[PDB]
Amino acid sequence: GSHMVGQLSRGAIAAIMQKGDTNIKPILQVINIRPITTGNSPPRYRLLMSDGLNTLSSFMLATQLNPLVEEEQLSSNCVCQIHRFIVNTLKDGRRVVILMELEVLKSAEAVGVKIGNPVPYNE
Numbered sequence: 001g002s003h004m005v006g007q008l009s010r011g012a013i014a015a016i017m018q019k020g021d022t023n024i025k026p027i028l029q030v031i032n033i034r035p036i037t038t039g040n041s042p043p044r045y046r047l048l049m050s051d052g053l054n055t056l057s058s059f060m061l062a063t064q065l066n067p068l069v070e071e072e073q074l075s076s077n078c079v080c081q082i083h084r085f086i087v088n089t090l091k092d093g094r095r096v097v098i099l100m101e102l103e104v105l106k107s108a109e110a111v112g113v114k115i116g117n118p119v120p121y122n123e
């Protein structure tokens, strides 16, 4: 409905990156999903997510959630609530957000557009 950006947890990306408290259950939009190079393990999916203010490309799906992607319930434009995530930090300092449990609140086809004008989150 009207005020589409009000459907998303504006500021959650910065909170996940700046404070790292995992108690929040933010509502985010999927902007894009792609496989990463895995070679010889289960496929792994990387997501570009939006909270309405920012996008962030550092999200990875837990492999237990792969069927959501592979059966097309989880695709570009859908709106999701994250019920469980963790943050991991690489040796080089970059952070990865692993999505463990999530719920699709609105399918891609029911939303249909990138909500708002989110900009990339910087480090």
Ligand SMILES: O=C(O)c1cc(-c2ccc(CN3CCc4cc(-c5ccc(C(=O)O)o5)ccc4C3=S)cc2)n(-c2ccc(Cl)c(Cl)c2)n1
Residues within 6 Å of the ligand: 035, 036, 037, 038, 046, 057, 058, 059, 060, 061, 062, 063, 064, 088, 089, 090, 094, 095, 096, 097, 098
């Ligand atoms: O081929 C490419 O294009 C590519 C390739 C990577 C790329 C490679 C390697 C890594 C390292 N790594 C790997 C898998 C992984 C899995 C889990 C985890 C916990 C629970 C579950 C589960 O149930 O599945 O999984 C927790 C931590 C990791 C980490 S730190 C990250 C990222 N990336 C990449 C680089 C930077 C970022 Cl910020 C991201 Cl999200 C991906 N891109």
